[model samples]
Every structure is written in C-alpha cells, then in structure tokens.
Target chain A: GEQKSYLENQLEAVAEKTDAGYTFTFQREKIKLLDGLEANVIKDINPFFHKEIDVTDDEVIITIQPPSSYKAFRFMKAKDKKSKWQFAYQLVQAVQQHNLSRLNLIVAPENIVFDKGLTPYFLHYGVKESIPPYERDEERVWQELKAAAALAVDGAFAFEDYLKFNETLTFSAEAKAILDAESYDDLLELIQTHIDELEAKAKTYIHIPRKKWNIQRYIGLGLIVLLVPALIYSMYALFFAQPKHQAIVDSNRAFLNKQYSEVISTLSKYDAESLPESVQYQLATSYVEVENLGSAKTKNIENNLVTLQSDPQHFLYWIDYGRGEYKEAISIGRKLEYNDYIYFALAKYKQQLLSEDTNDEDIQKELDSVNSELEKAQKERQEN
Target chain B: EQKSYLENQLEAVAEKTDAGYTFTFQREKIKLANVIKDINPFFHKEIDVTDDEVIITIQPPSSYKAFRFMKAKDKKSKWQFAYQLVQAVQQHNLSRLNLIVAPENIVFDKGLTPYFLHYGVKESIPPYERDEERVWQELKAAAALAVDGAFAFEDYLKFNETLTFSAEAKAILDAESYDDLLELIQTHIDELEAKAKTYIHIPRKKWNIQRYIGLGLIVLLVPALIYSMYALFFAQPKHQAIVDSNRAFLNKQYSEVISTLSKYDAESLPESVQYQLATSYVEVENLGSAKTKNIENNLVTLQSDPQHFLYWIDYGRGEYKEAISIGRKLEYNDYIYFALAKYKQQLLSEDTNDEDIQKELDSVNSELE
Candidate 1:
C-alpha cells in the first residue's frame, strides 16, 4: 500500500490521505495557541473542529472528512426559496448552538459552502483557548444574511438596491410581515413559523420599470432661465453701478459752474423731501439767483425750506433775509458758523436801518462794522 | 372754474391733512378703483370711495410721481420702476384691461416700488379687444423712454443702444409673457450697471513730436522670441523608455525591460510600463524575492485593474481578504493559487475552528494533487 502526499509551501503545511479521510500537518510555529490546544478540548468547544488532533515536538496534525458532493455558497441561486430558507435556518441554528460571534464565521458567499442536501458549512482556521463572553451582535449577522439573500434573490449589489427590490415585489400581508421583521429574534421566529408561506410568496415575480425622466436636465434649465440672469445682474450691480446720489452730484457740479438754470432744472424735478439737504439748498439758491425771480419762485423756495427741516439753517436765514424778514433772518443767522458771518452782519445792519425807532448813530455803526468785516474778509481772501 | 390739478384725465384738488396728501376727484373716477382692485397693492394700495368724490390718499414720502424720482439718476430704481409698471399691467388680464404706462401716471414709495395710477377698461371702447401685442410694445418703449429722459444727451445715447441691443437679444420688445418682459428689463438694468462701473473714459491726447518719436521707436524695436525645449529633452526620452520597454517585453527579454524602465522614476512610468516592469521583475527574479516584491507593490500602488488576473494573484498571495473580495467579482476561477490563498486565510482567521481548517486544508491539498 502506497501513501499520497501534497505540500503547500506558502502555508508550510502538508496533507496525506488516510483510510478514514485526510490529515493536515502544520508546523507548530505556523498555528496560534497550538501549545494550549488539545483534540478533546477543541472538539468539545466547537463541532466544526476534528476530535483527533496530534501534537508533536515540531508539528500539529489534524484530521477531517468533508461531504462528497458540495458547492460553494456563492454558486447557489435564490431561484428556490425553500432551499435558501433551509440554508438560512441551518446557519442561524448552528450559530446560536455554538454561541458564535460573526467574527467566528467566514460569512462571505465564496467561503460558506453547501452540501447536496442543502446543508450549510463554512471553512474554519483555528481554535480559541477560551471563548470570551462579550456582546455578540446577532442583528448584524441577520443583516448580512439578508444582504446575501438579496444578492442571490435580486442580483443586487447594494443594500439600498435590496430595499428597493423588496419594495417593488408583490407579497402577501403575512409574507411582508415576515420579511419586515425588526429584530434577529423576531426574524428567526417568523422564518421558522412561516417558511411555507414565504416560499409561496417568493414564487411571484413582477417586472420593474426603469426611470424615465432626467430631472436634472429640467432643473438645470429652470436655473438658467430663472436664476442665472438675476445672479449675473446682482454681480454687475454690485461691482459696476453708478453712485446712488448721482443727481445731487450733477446739481452740485452745475451750481459750482454758476449754471443756476440747469441746477434748478435738475434738482427741482425731484420732490423736496426726496432730495438731500444739500441738494435742496442748491435748488433754493438757484431759485434765488435766477434773473427776474417772481413771488411764485420765492414761495417755492419758502416751501422747499419747510421740507428741509433737517440741516444747514443758513438757507433759511438767506431766504428770510431775501424776503425782507430781517428780524427773523438775524435771529437764525446769530447761531450760524463764522464762515456765514456776512449773512448775519448784513441781516443785522438791515434790521437796524429799517427800524423806525433806531437812531442814525446806531445804524451807521452797524453799517461801518459790517463794511469793515467785509473788507477784512476780502483782504484775507486775496492773501490766501 | 375751481382750480384743480389735472392727473391722468381726472381733475383733483390736493389737500394736505394730518394723515397724508388727499386728492379728491371732481368727477367719478370710481371706475378706476374697480379696475385696479385685483392688482397688487405694492403697485396700488386700497383707495377710499365716497358718494360725491373718489379720494386717493398717499403717504408723504412716496406721494411723489415716478418722474420726480427718475430725476435722481438712480438707474436701479428707474429700471425697477419700469419692471413694476409692466408687472402691474401683466397682472390684469391684458386682453381685457390696460394701464396708462407713463412716468406721470406712476408713483413710487421710498423703497422704489411703483404704483400704477391710471387704469382703463379696454372693452368699454368700440373695438372691445385691446391689442395685447401693442400694449407690450408701448410698455417697453415707455420704460426705455423714461430711463433715457433721466440721463444726459451723451449718456442717453449709450443707455439707449445698450437697451436696444439687449431688447433684440432677449426678445423683450415683442415678449408675450410678463416674465419674458421682466427678464429683458433686468438685462437692461444689469448692462447699465455693469457699463457704469467698467467704462473708462480715456481722453485722446494731442499728438506731439515726442509722442511720435516714442511710437516709432516702439514699433521698430519690438519684434519678439520664445521657443519650446521640453518636447525634445524630457518628453522624448520618457516616450522612448515606454516604447523600448514595451518592445523588450514583447521580445521576452525581461532583463532589458527592467534595465530600460529602472532609469526613470516609478511614478513617471506609463501605466503600461508599470505593469510591464513588475511582470519583468517577476520573470527575472524569484517570485518571493525582495526586488520582485518591490516592483509588484509599485504596480499594485500605482495602478490597479480589477479585471487583470495577475494583479488578483498578487493580492491573493499577500492580501487574502482583498483577493477573495475581488475574486468574487471575477468570472475567471481556474487559478489554483486563489484556492490555496483561501486555505491560508482560513488558517489565519481567529474565527476558523481547527476542524474547519482541517477540512479546508484537505480540499486545498486535493486540488493541488
């Protein structure tokens, strides 16, 4: 009788055939926790492990016998719901029986293989010296099983696709309830109780329609038609528009150029309230300077003064003095700044002269003082 | 005759009260209020009606006619005034009603929202149907006219041309809908604003002898130079290396492929050479040799193609999870190395029990045999 042997250089392991099945011999250094491992202990700890493990000085040999007809779980299809249900039921029961963590199983389709009788088996690598007591999230394992089932059932790659596929399917109320279980425990109970109902529901298949409308194109067009021009306009206005006070600016320029008529024409078109205080002053002054000014023009200037209730009382003093209200003009002009002293002095001189009770000496003194101040201002102006 | 102010075909005496300026019409223009009842209050607020006279009270600051505000040279307000007028008219079913679209017949608030003052029922006339097309034409023309009236003669010409160009481009003058008309007005306003900011007035200088001499010197002395050098030196050699390595690979001279490609930086190598050099390294050295590992790692790092079976084999040797993951997607399953990798992975996994490993190891051994 001859013996057959195979060597795997990468794994540093050897395999030889036996009457019972096959034995795998690995270098002691290749396996973790090999020193603490014993055949009986491993067999008692996990049903997947062999009961005949041999330990030597440099090697550990283990024996196993696999099913004669088996296929990788990846090769299985969801065409038969009964078969998939049986596979899932066996997997969950085995996991619960062994008190296994998801970490303890190779959950991938390629690694979880199936026997001819639809029994599920997975490849195992090593044994733990002690099974740690920790939180084993069985919900996560349920989700993985659901995902794998989806891939088999609907040929879906993403979990979201699985959800959409489930939604599109036509299912009985009871079948939907089973599929919609909220917890692993609930799911196990439902699958166990309603296996035949689920199988019957899975037999119905309905065609799904592909999406038709390109909503992005319509949205993009809407934006271009409704929003782009407004956005561009806002940008242009922010960076490029003229100053808001352009009319007042033009009026000021005209007034400086002694173009009184143009200044009046420009500033008079605006409401007295809408014009700035300075613009109102410009318009009022232009009305005063226009040749052959009428009582109506004077009345317009008076009306403008009423509207300009806010700054520069000089305009009021000038208007009052021009209208021959020297008493009122002098009263307002007294509070004016030094630069407007001419108007104050003129108003004071006129008021003194017009009074019937005022003496000649007082009037002459006022006139002389006003003249002296005027000459002084003129002289200062020339020197500058 | 009582002296009354004439405003849009109705005579009214304006009197100032504590509330606002009140205009009491001498005759019944009560029909005007009825016509504009459905219009936006932003355009025209609710009016108080009486048996003898129709009284329209407007708040002080906004009581000014739109033309008065237009004189302020606020381009945005002017365009907005035009748009609001058009919008108000559009709100009334144009086929049945019309507004006297003029600056004098419109009023503005401090915020520049315009109100339409004169509303007319077109069906009252013999023709009975208003020319909606003509109405829009007049509306567009009036808006342009009002805006132009605010600017100086020179400024008016520029503003008019901009509006005309925009109107034609935007099809504003013949716009059928209020939105289309408004879009045109907004375009005009935007153009004016952009123009005001970007336009630079450079005065033409008088040509002098010195200026002519400088211009002549510039014209004579400034003919120019720059030539390309990169294509000949750097790019050509890199291209040559790629071609040479590809030829060497085809010739089965793996050492030549390695020798030629090793001269360049690994990243600079083309995607084709990145793969070629790694394959060449494996051919020239042992699969497990450090140099081969370095090149293969570079290939894996630089460019990875899932469809390329060799790349998956390399992954299977070093990265088991990735190998299994990628192999799941591939239809090519003939590689025995992949099975050996899965077996090796099983031995390494903490979850894999000893018995499972024994069975997987047996499967791998049988496959090898």
Candidate 2:
C-alpha cells in the first residue's frame, strides 16, 4: 500500500523542479537541481526508495514503463513581463471576437506601449492578423492607449470637448499606464487617486468657445422663405403683363391710316357676339366699306346697327333703303324729316317703273322732280 | 443793323455752314421759282424743275403733343376722315375711326347727306359718349356726298393757313393748291400706275464680290475635297501595285503576284503584267485556261524577248512537250527547266505515279534544289 501510495500520490513524468531543492520523478528517470535553477523538485519511484538526480542541462528526456497509466502534464511561461503581455494580447483578441469583456474578464498587457515590442512578436504569431501592421504606428498606438483608458473609466473617454484635443486627450495614456497595473483593483485604485491630477493637467489648456452661438441664421432662413418667391413673381409681372388684346392698339392705328379692310381682318378673331358697341360699330362699318351694302353680311351689319336706338328714324330709313324697301324708306324719311328722302324717292320711282307697269317717261319725270327738289334743297342751303 | 440783316441773309446758304462748297443740302427746295436756277449754275448745269404757282407750304414739324388736337382740327376737313367714314356706308359699322370722328370729330359741309346715306346705306354707330345721335347724322351726311363731293371740302380745308410753309413737309409730298393747274393736273395721276407704294429705305449700296466668291467656292469645294479624298485613299494606285506585283513575281510570291493583278484584264494590261501572270502560272503549276490565256497572249507580245519567256509561256499553257522543245532551244537557263522536263518525262512514261512517279518527282525536285 505504501508503494501504491507513492505511485498514487500524483507523481508525473514531466516535472517542475525548483532551485529551492525540490525533486520530481517519472518512472525510472529522475530530475534534481539546486540553488541555480529557478525552482527544484524531487520525485519518488516507489514508496521504499527514491532518487535525487542532477540535471545540469536545462531539460532532460527519459523513458517510462508500461504503467502508461501515466500521462505527462506541463506548464510554460516566459521569464518576465513579455509572456504575460503575449497572453494578454491573445486574451484581447478573444475578447474582441466574442465580446468577453462583457463578462468582465480582463488582463494586464505589458507596462509598455503595444507596437514596439509586442506588435513585432505577434507579427509572426498571427496576433497581427486581428491587429494589423499599419495600426501599429505611433498614432494608432496612442489612439489605442486612449481607448483603453476610456474602457477603464466608465466606458467613456476622459477628455473635455472645447479643450485642446491633444492636451486633454493625454490623460487617457496615463490611464492606460495605470490600467497596465497587473490587477483590476489596482487599476481602479490608481484611477481613484490620479484621475483628478490628470484632469488638472488636461485643463491647463485654454477653453474653446462653443460653435452654436450668436449666428444670424434665422434671418437668413426667413429671407429665403419669404422674399425669393416675391422677387420671382414681381419679375414675372414686369416683363409679361402685355395684354392679349394688343389688336385694339393696332386697329386704332389702322383706323387713322384709313385702312378699313385691315381693321376688319384684324378684329375678326374677336367674338362678334361679345364685342363692345364701339368695336362692333368698327367691325360693322369695316364690313360695309370693304364690301358693299348688297353683301351677304349686310343683315349681320343691320343686326349690329339694331343697338343704335338713339337714331331710330335714321336707322329705319337706312335699313329700309338698304333692303330696297323704297316706299318704307320714303315713309320713314318723310315722317322724320331725315336727309334720305331723295334717295328713297328715286328708288321708289324706279321700283314703280319696274313693278307697276309705269312708263319710262313717268319714271323720268318723277326722278326729275326728285332732282329738282334736291337742287332746291341744296340752293336753299347756300342761300341760308 | 443793315449789316446784321445782310449777315442774316448771307449766313443761311448750305455752303456757308461748311468749309467745303462740295457738300450739298439733302433736300433742295425753292420758295422763289428762280432759286432752282440760281443753284443750277453753281451746281450741275443740266438741272431742271418747274414751278407750282401756289406756294409750296411745308408745315413745320409740330411738337409731339397728344394726337387729340390734329384730330379735332381735321374736323372741318370732311375728307380727313373720308376713308374711315366710307366704311360705315358699306357695312353700317361705326368703327372707332368713324365713331371717334362722328359730329364731335368733324363737321361736314352743312345740309348735305353723305354718299352712303343718299344711297340709303345703313351703318351702326357706337352707343358711347352720348354722341350716337351726332355720329348717325355725320354718317348719313358723309354717305350722301358724291365721290367728288368731298374733294372741294378737302380743298377748303387746304386753303388759307398753308401760305407759311416750313420745313416739316416737303414738295416731294402731294400737292394741295386748288388753283395751280399744273399741281391739280399732277394729282390726276393714278397713284397705282405711278407705283407710289412705300418701300423700305436701305441706303447702303456697296457689294463684296471676292468674299462672296470665296464663300461660293467654300460651298463648292468642301464636297469636292471629300470626293477627291475618297478617290485617293480607297481607290488603288496603279504605280505601286504594278511595281509591287512585279517585285512579288521576282520574289517567288506566285499567288500574291497572281492576285495583285486580279483586277486587271490580262489582254489589256502591258506586257510586264502578261510576263508576271505567265510566270506565276508556271510557278503555281496551274496550267488551266486562266494561265493559258495569259500565256497565249504574252507569247504574241513577247516574241523578241528572252527564250525563257517562250519557255515559261509554253509551260503555263500545259503544252509540256512544247515547253521542253523550247527549253532545248535555250542557250543557258536555270535548272528549273531541266527539272520540269524530267517531271514531264515521268508523266509521259505510263509510270505515272502508278507507283514510281514518286521517285521521278523526287529526282525532279532534287535536281531543282
């Protein structure tokens, strides 16, 4: 049972022997070292006997027996701070990949900046795969340091806006060095003690004025909103206000030129039913003058004249005369003392010759009488 | 004061205003009948003109006032509004011309009806300005006038005030004097027959012949240059091609030489082309009608040239026997003829590649090499 206990008491193949005089054994091989080794170990083969063997070299290889129930276990670390830094970098990559920092697990990198010593080592180690080479410049290193500080302190950067960026932002590097303090409690304690000093050093720069004050922007906005359309509409009215009825000015000039046919053609585009009396009169007179009274438009002309009610007798007289209503014209002229009597009377005499089987001599005599009356009327005017 | 009067009298000549007597006034007019003769001696001698006995009164240019005054003054002149009022006679349309005149714009000779109303012409007057009654009467009076009835009133309007003619109107315009027999007869001229129509006055008369010629040439030459470029670039140049194919024939580029003359009709081309075609056919060994025709044509043309001409021509024609006969007659020639002779001999022997013609072909090629 003693021999079984020696084998069962966790003796293993590979060993950590300290220079402090510890020994370890695996099957038949033994390791011994003293004082010069960083640590030493002693190993027992069976309960009755054990050996302390010297291994002057740093390591040894030895054979083991069939109890092969034994598997070797080993641990490794670098001599100083660099190994921990390397581990820290791996931990950070793992944390970055899975956001393991959410679980609050942490590591302290070397008390130095990352790129100079650490980025070079990881260049071959593939740690530079996640943290690339270009990100290893001084600027990027400074940025990473600042970010680490921010993550350390309430997950926010320790700098004031409106202060000099470099001067205020430098406290982050201080926080980075403090967080490199090997333990999270130590990091928090350092922050608690040195944060005010960092803030004091950062605020030595002059304060920057805020950007959002004393602007005339509302007045600018008002002008754009209110005045732009007003200017555009005013410009439109100035250039475009000529009337579509420019023909009025044209016909006025044409009338002065005594161009009657021109006036009719010009005014034809206007609706005859809607024309003012003045324009209607111009159009009617233009029709009569350009063509004659026997024109098919004569009835339209007479219809247009229907509005001339003030000269009812004259209208009736002329209307009758134009329609060859000679007796009617004569009757109208006699009743009104209008100037159209001779024209109506002569027309009636001709009509009688044509319609009532009157002789040419009778027609001539009647026309002669009408002529005598017209000459007497003219002479009487001269005498008066 | 007498000197001042004389100064005033003498200072007014057109020549007195300028240093040079060569300059002339734009319009030469004479109130005196004799002044046309006075300018005639100092100016051109052949100048001719006649007098209108009534004074040619040119009214001074009136200031630009509202048109209302001349319109109102023209009232007594029935003919001033004659053309406008004539419209009311035809269609009874009292246009603004007629309506604006009415009894307010004009007063016709008293107690007379217009020609239109006398013929019982009806017209409408506008209902504006309370002047409809007056417009109707004026229209009626104007209608009853004979065509000549308005002429005297026109003269009556022209009567007294025109004696003080100024520079505003010119003698170049129509005559107004009622008594000048000459001026009155002048008005009888048919204006249409005289072609008294308005025309735009463009006084510049210079012409640029060369610039127009250059422009015409530009219009003409651009297409000419394009056509010329097409003829030069896309069309074949004969000299390089004839020379190129001749060089090709010498370089043993038989197919190239043959195709280079593809566009040429062999009979019409020069003997050099015939020679090239004959040799290309011999080299390509195409003793077909195409090669034979070319060879036959060149045999006639190349009678006095080297013996090889007949040799190759005969060879091109596939008369191998004749080709060998001509080759035997040659004084000295390349081994190609001998090789060709051996090839023909094998063909003649019934040994025709039946099996052993390959040996003959090898002998022939080796001899040539």
Candidate 3:
C-alpha cells in the first residue's frame, strides 16, 4: 500500500507539471500522454515529458507536450485596428473615390485598447487535450486567429469590394486579351464596357474623400486613366468606330447651335449603363463659353438660337488635331479657340462659306488675342 | 484680437455656425480633449471658440475612451472573448488544432494551429503591429495572457523532425462548414507545400480564417467537390473508389505501400490509378516508382519521380488529414496550397492529368488528400 500510494502520488505529481511531463526531456523517445494527463487531450505527440518555461508578458505562449518550439498552440483574436477586416471598405472606397494611398484605414474605429496585456483573453479558449504532441480542438484557436488575421489584413472585406473591381477589370482584360480581340471593333466594345463601368464607379466615388479609401491612389489613378482614354476614344470611335460610348447629354448629338453637336449626334447616342468619361469632357466643354450666365444655361438647354445660322462640319476639329490632319485641324481648332460654340460654328460656317479657300480672317483675329493671352498666362504661371 | 480669435475658432468647425453661434455647455463633449473637431476652413469660426475647446481638441481622452469601450462586450462583431482583451486568449489555442484519428498519428503528432490571427509566441517576430495605437498592439497584450488559457493552442518547442511520407486518396467527410478564402488557400496549400509563409498574403485587412478557408474551398470546389465526385463516382484520381471512401475530408497514401488508401482502411490499398497506375518505377524503393524517362522525339514527355513533391503531398494529407488540403490547395488560394497546386498543375495540370494521366492523377490526389 505504501509503494502504491507513492506511485499514485508520483503520477499525480507528473500530471501537475505545467510546462512539461509525459514529454521527452530531450530529443529522445517521446512518451505518449496517458489518459488523464492534464484532464484534457493535448497535441497527441507520444505524450513525453519535457522542460517547462515561464511565459513572458509579451508572448501568448502555448506549451505543447512533445514541446514543439515553432508549433505553438493557435489562438483566436478579434480584429486588430490593423486587421484586414476593413480592407473592403478601403479598397472599394479607394477605387470608387479614385484614391489608393490609404489602404489601411479603419471602417469601424478600433475602440478597444489594452494597457497591460491580452494573453489573459486568449487564455479563455485554451483547452487541454489529454492527447500528446497534436491537440484536438487546438485548431479552433488557429482558425479564430486566422479569422482575426484575415480581418486585420482586410482581405475578406476587400475581396469583393475595391479589389473585386480591380479583379474584375484585370480579369476582364485578361479574358478579352485571351480572345485575341484583333480588330478595333473588338477592342472598342470590350474597352468601352470596362471604361463605362470604371467611369460610373469613378463618378460615384468622386464624391468620397480620399483618406477613407484603401489604395486610394491606385484606384483613383485606374479610374481616371481608363475613363479618360475610353471617353476620348469611345467618342470618336462611335461614328467612325463604335457608337456605344456616345454621350448622355441630349444636345451633344446635333448642333442646334454648336458645330460638334451634329457630328456627335451623327456619331452615336450616349447611353452607356456605366459612366461615360465623355460627360466630364462635355461638361468641361460646356463651360468653355466662359460667360457664367451662358455656361449655366448650357448645362441643360443649349442656346442654339444665339449662335450662327446652321450647324456645320462635324469631325470635331479636336479629333482632326488628334488624327494628324494638322492643317485641317488648325482650321477647325482656331475656329473653336476664339469663339463660343455658336460663334465657332458660325466662324466655321463662314469658313465653309469660302469653300477650298483657306481664310485667315476670323482665325487670325482670335489667334492674335490668344497669342497675347497665352503669353500673358504663361508669364503669370511662371511668376508663381 | 478677441474677435479675431473668435472668428478663427468659428471657421475651424465643420458644422454650420451654431445658428448665430449658440454655444452649448456639455462637459462630456469637452471630456475627450484630444479628439479634434473637424475644422471648417471657409469661415474664421475657430477664433470664436474658447481656449478650453482648443485644448480639448488637441488630445482628447482617447486612452480612456478605449478603456471604457473595452470594458463592455463587443457589439455586432464575431469576436468571442472576454471584454478584458487579455482574458480573451485563454481559449485561442484549443480552437486552432486538428484532432483527427489515424494510423500514422505519430507523424501528425503536432496538430495545425492557425498562428496569424491568433498571434502568439509562435512567430519569430513579435506579433504586435508597429504603431502603438494600432489595434494589433492591444490584441498582442491580450494574447500575452493566453499562457494559462485552458485551450492554449501550441507547445513550447520541438524540432529535428524527419519527413514521414504519405499518399492521396478519396476523402470520407467534408470539413466543418466554416469557410474563408485565404484560410482555405492556406490549409490546402500547406497540405501540398507543407509550410506557409510568415507574412499574410491576403489583399487587405481581411485576415479572416474562416474566409480564407471558405474561399480556399470555393476556389477548389469545382475540382474538390465537382471533380472529386467524378473521382469517387467514377472511382478515383487514377484508381477505383473503395466501399466507403471520403473524398475531401480524409484520404491519404503511404509511400511505403504500393497501392492507394483512405481513412476507412488505414493500411490497405483500396484501389489503383486507372486500374493500373503509371508502371511502378523499377529503380528505387520510393521515388523510383514514380519516374518515367522522356523521349521527346516520340512526342513523349519524360516523368521525373519526385519523391520530395510526392512526399510533401503525402505528409500534408496524412498529417493534416486533408482538412488543410481541401481548404487551401484545390481551392483558389495563394498560399502554399495553391503554390503546390500550381507546381502540380504546371507539372501535371490543374484540371487534367496531362501526361501519364495516372502519374498526374497521383500527384494531384497526393496533394489534396
């Protein structure tokens, strides 16, 4: 009975060891953790006894039976402010808002802060598996930890959000590219769709502030670049290429008063489900009248009656400039720079009046003024 | 000058002038001194504010605010832990390990415990984020107290490991119904690659384990579920299905054996690849069985018996019991699982057993199961 009592006490003592026991003291034969080792099954490594070490305040340490130095028990954590949980908000907001700089912004503020330590919190889910080197439910903590980490990374949030947008773009581009879309038509249709989607997103995001977004710089840049190029190309491609990207503005089609109106109208109707970059350009052009009162009115109804007799030559002199018909481009370009759309149209109307005869009259008048203005504006810019 | 100060203060506000500058006297508002108010730059309204308000905005009682909120249970979040951050980590480790049963349990002695989200002493680098005010820093403190946690996930230290080989087969069960993309990728990838990257690869703050696991499965579901069905119903990756073989939950192979095996039958060759896998390599004991010489002139691609590659898959399936494989590898993941998948697909093919179909199938199966 004395020997039995002593053995029982020894077994109890072995079980009581917090750091090691039933584990190998060295890298020798591992002893299996018999039932009732710590009242729970631990990592099922042949439950051998090993050395015990004290936990530090900085480390949320887990001591396994077979004593795996690297294989620390996994624990679950709540999303840290830096956790990727807010990634989606940041990502989407960044792309939508056209900003990609701040990718680590928090969606919900991290209201929790600990002064001393959080190991006590992790201690809650810690369960003792009577098993050896491998633990049964130990993975749950790892799972939770992964969730916390993923949240911290904001990967889950960003997956379908801003990153989704980029993913969609890159994927669609890759897919389109894969199809070997050789012709301009194929490129136009595919690119227009992406541009439209991007433009629409950009338009919506344009109202959002930049700091709130994840990768705001990249997204903003993506939207702007794609939207701008598509807008410009889509515009011209409509008549000579693809008609899908025309303008939503009613007056853009026909020159009730302006010259590009008829050509634009003849080109295509602007009704892309996604935002069309042309809107910005058109809006900017609408303001070219410079006279505040006239600009305001042009926002809705065009004052065609105030312009020249009839809407004339289309090709949007700017298009000609872009296409390298420099002389023809200059003719139309000079007409537009000097006057309002109507006046420009009238000037073109007059210039057309002299068929085959290149007139320097109206253009020369505006050119002189522009030369002086450009020279003056250039000087002002340099002074600053 | 007083008027000028008042004007400047007034304009510093983002809100409209208090309807003719009606000042409210809420001590609570002033309590958070460091919490700065949005300054409206348009009007010189900031000048009108009292000196106390300016001081209040500079460094509102942020630390106290954090304390107050932390004292209460989290509202509308999945974080299941005590309000005291440090006290929440007790159960973290237990919730992270795998407790599967098997013959080669010795090899899988160290169960998987997700270390990232549940940051602990596992990582070489301290888990806390760089910023002091960052939430991870706070979480790290809480994690520090996890040492005495009942469910502590990891053991102190063990090393000098020898590789135990494995093979892939049909699984018997599906993983528990929690899923996440990156986690999914990581698990499956690790099954094939046998190791994960220390740095997280997810796009943003989406460090969700469930999402990683779930998304990992989603990516692999087509082949994991759909193709797995074909393997099971139509027999196997390159063999016939056993009476009750698991597809993605439990399946493995022992390189020591000559035939395929699964969870149901611990040490029996349940089936063969295509009734006859790539003719066993007649050279070596392990890798020699998988080798095939290439004679390109005959439009034949040579097969290299990759004991390392096969061993990795074997180790992954046998050790992790395919839970990791189903989550990360066959799934659309970027971690070790996907990398191995890419390696196999590039070597074998992601969707097809390209050359020596049986060999490719063997590689893929070993990877997943």
True contacts kept of each: 0.00, 0.00, 0.00
Q: For candidate 2, lDDT tens digit of each residue in B227-257?
A: 4444344322443355456546545688887
Off by over 4 Å in 3: A1-224, A236-384, B1-369
Q: Rank order by lDDT, top first?
A: 1, 2, 3
- Best candidate per TM-score, number? 1
lDDT of each: 0.50, 0.37, 0.28
lDDT of 1 by residue, A228-289 (tens): 44545444443332222344545655664578788766655455555545555665576567
Error of 3 at A372 (Å): 30
**Backbone collisions counted per model:** 3, 39, 221
lDDT of 2 at B124: 16
Between prediction 1 and prediction 2, the one with superior TM-score is 1
Which residue pairs collide, candidate 1?
A49-B355, A125-B352, A126-B352
Model 1 residue A381 lDDT?
Answer: 76
Give the winner by lDDT: 1 or 3: 1
Interface RMSD of each: 40.6, 48.1, 31.1
